[PDB]
Design a protein around this ligand. Sequence first.
Ligand SMILES: [Ca+2]
Ligand SMILES: [Ca+2]
Lengths: 141, 141
Amino acid sequence: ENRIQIMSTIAKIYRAMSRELNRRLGELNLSYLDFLVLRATSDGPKTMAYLANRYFVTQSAITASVDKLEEMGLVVRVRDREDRAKILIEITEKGLETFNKGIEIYKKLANEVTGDLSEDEVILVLDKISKILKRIEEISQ
Amino acid sequence: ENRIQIMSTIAKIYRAMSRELNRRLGELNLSYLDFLVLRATSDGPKTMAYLANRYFVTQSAITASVDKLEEMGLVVRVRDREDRAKILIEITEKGLETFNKGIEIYKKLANEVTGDLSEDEVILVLDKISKILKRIEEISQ
Ligand SMILES: [Ca+2]
Ligand SMILES: [Ca+2]
């Protein structure tokens, strides 16, 4: 029915978007996951546990992405002055510049895919699916 | 902006849904991917290449899922009478019964997550995001 198809359509959109984002982000030497790590750290340092949980990936996947971004000079591991065991992933100036280029790629793609929708239609959809997100996040965890 | 957030919200919804589906489908001894393989074959036999492409996963992931469903007696590998190299994954009666239970789990979860949306609101969203899906599929491949 309708409610089923809304969720299945969201899934198909995500898969297709993920494929294209990986392709376009590739020119920035990033994968979609790498870009998400930069997005997460762009507004403040994040624990690796947070990253894995928030974006639903394995801790090994986060370790791999962070190791990569670190070698690329986009993020750094920050340790507590009294306990270096406590780690936070902090974005670098270079990381922020790359993130900004990535967000622009995202912006352009988003405009393209929603091209059939007028500003108002975009508004209706956003407001409504925002409620779906709130519920599933309350349900799943 | 709005168009960006529509796509990012869709992504968050997908991740959260995926987590919960894996959890609920688990009781049916299935992962979300396994369930998708059953969904794909429920209406007709599918090539393994199709499965990997349609649901954006690696061929090794499909091989693993198909090997599993085959051992579970939910699907079978069908070969051409003149060229056994040509393979199609066909669902079994048991596979269809399990798929049906899976679709019911999906149905209930969908009703829950879209609970804040009235039938009409569900209609508006579906019609509109369907256009987004058409575009991204045209763009990505
Ligand atoms: Ca909860
Ligand atoms: Ca095309």
